[PDB]
């Protein structure tokens, strides 16, 4: 029971960019289904099909696959779509490819949710997806902040709480990303004692490791020491590793040696 379109209104809009699964081709193109809005079909017309000249009709369509699309005039009376494929900007295709995949994942999760709860998708998107899209602009960003922050479900009225529990479990299992921020610090020392200073630096860099983020400067060479961190929020590893670099500098400036940075902390 797959239904319940991705965005606010059932019908396409003015100059909107979508994507289409194609099934059938009669004479003037293909009146074929959508999977960005409900499940309605639309005309792709041959004069407005491809950039090159239309040499073949079978190759460029690829029945049963995903394709770019733009709607010109929406038949907001009965459910018809006039649709285009040629006039989508090269930068526009890829950004819609995002929007489309963005929309698809939320449905992929809430499908599993409905099929396991046998509640029609319409009610689930009504109760959950639409308030999330209203609050955060995208249900995908709402899901990501749900992984981080629990307060995303406050102000929402699920049809049942077990839906929330299983959705949270499935999102923590499937939508799990902890980005590895890594850096390299070059020891350019020529000084008196360097290995004791390095041990002190490693201890002072490793005792700082928190419960959630643990920093281990691993060895791959003498000058080049590698700093690996698991940034849970993609914004704390930077400050951790900057503090680490400051502490390395505090170490090196007085024993006699010198060190330099080769790569700073990067995601």
């Amino acid at each position: 029971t797959s239904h319940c379109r991705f965005y606010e209104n059932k019908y396409p809009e003015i100059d909107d960019i979508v994507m289409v699964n194609v099934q059938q081709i009669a004479e003037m193109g293909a009146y074929v289904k959508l999977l960005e809005y409900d499940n309605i079909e639309g005309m792709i017309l041959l004069s407005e099909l491809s950039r090159r000249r239309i040499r073949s009709i079978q190759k460029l369509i690829r029945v049963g696959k995903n394709d770019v699309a733009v709607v010109l005039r929406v038949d907001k009376e009965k459910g018809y779509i006039d649709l285009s494929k040629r006039r989508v900007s090269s930068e526009d295709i890829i950004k819609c490819e995002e929007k489309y995949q963005k929309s698809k994942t939320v449905h992929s999760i809430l499908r599993y949710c409905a099929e396991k709860f046998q509640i029609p998708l319409e009610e689930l998107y009504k109760t959950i997806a639409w308030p999330l899209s209203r609050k955060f602009g995208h249900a995908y960003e709402a899901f990501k902040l749900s992984i981080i922050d629990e307060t995303v479900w406050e102000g929402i009225e699920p049809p049942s709480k077990d839906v929330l529990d299983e959705l949270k479990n499935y999102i923590s299992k499937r939508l799990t990303p902890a980005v590895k921020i890594r850096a390299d610090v070059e020891v350019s020392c020529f000084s008196y004692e360097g290995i004791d200073a390095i041990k002190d630096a490693l201890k002072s860099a490793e005792d700082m490791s928190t419960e959630q983020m643990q920093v281990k400067v691993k060895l791959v060479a003498a000058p080049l020491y590698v700093l690996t961190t698991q940034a849970l929020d993609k914004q704390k590893g930077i400050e951790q590793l900057e503090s680490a670099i400051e502490k390395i500098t505090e170490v090196i400036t007085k024993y006699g040696g010198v060190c330099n940075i080769t790569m700073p902390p990067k995601a």
């Binding site: 004069s47 407005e48 010109l72 285009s84 006039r87």
Partner: protein
């Protein structure tokens, strides 16, 4: 003189993507620049007469909205060094502006004709389509 507040439509009709652009008598104040490529999708048909009717009808609607009732016409080809000949579409735009309510008078052509200068683009042997 029954208070026909006047305008100048100034259709510029090229061999592609004609223009309709109604402005005041001095020409300083624009009203509904809206053009030929505004309302057609092919980008090949921008010169087509249908583009002319569509552009003309919407600019006439804006003309009634603002208040202009009577219009003088400045028909202009590309002119200059290019082809001196009015665009295929613009004539249809003239017809539409005649039709849709607007009163018309004082038809003029203002195609810029040069006095033989600015060597025309194309080389000696010219376009060799």
């Amino acid at each position: 003189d029954n208070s026909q507040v006047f305008g100048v439509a100034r259709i510029f009709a090229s061999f592609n993507d004609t223009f309709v652009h109604v402005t005041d008598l001095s020409g300083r104040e624009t009203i509904a620049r809206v053009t030929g490529g505004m309302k057609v999708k092919a980008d090949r048909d921008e010169s087509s007469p249908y583009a002319a009717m569509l552009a003309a009808q919407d600019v006439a609607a804006k003309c009634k909205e603002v208040g202009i009732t009577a219009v003088h016409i400045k028909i202009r080809a590309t002119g200059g060094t290019r082809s001196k000949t009015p665009g295929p579409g613009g004539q249809a735009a003239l017809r539409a502006l005649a039709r849709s309510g607007l009163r018309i008078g004082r038809i003029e052509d203002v195609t810029p004709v040069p006095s033989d200068s600015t060597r025309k683009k194309g080389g000696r042997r010219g376009r060799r389509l």
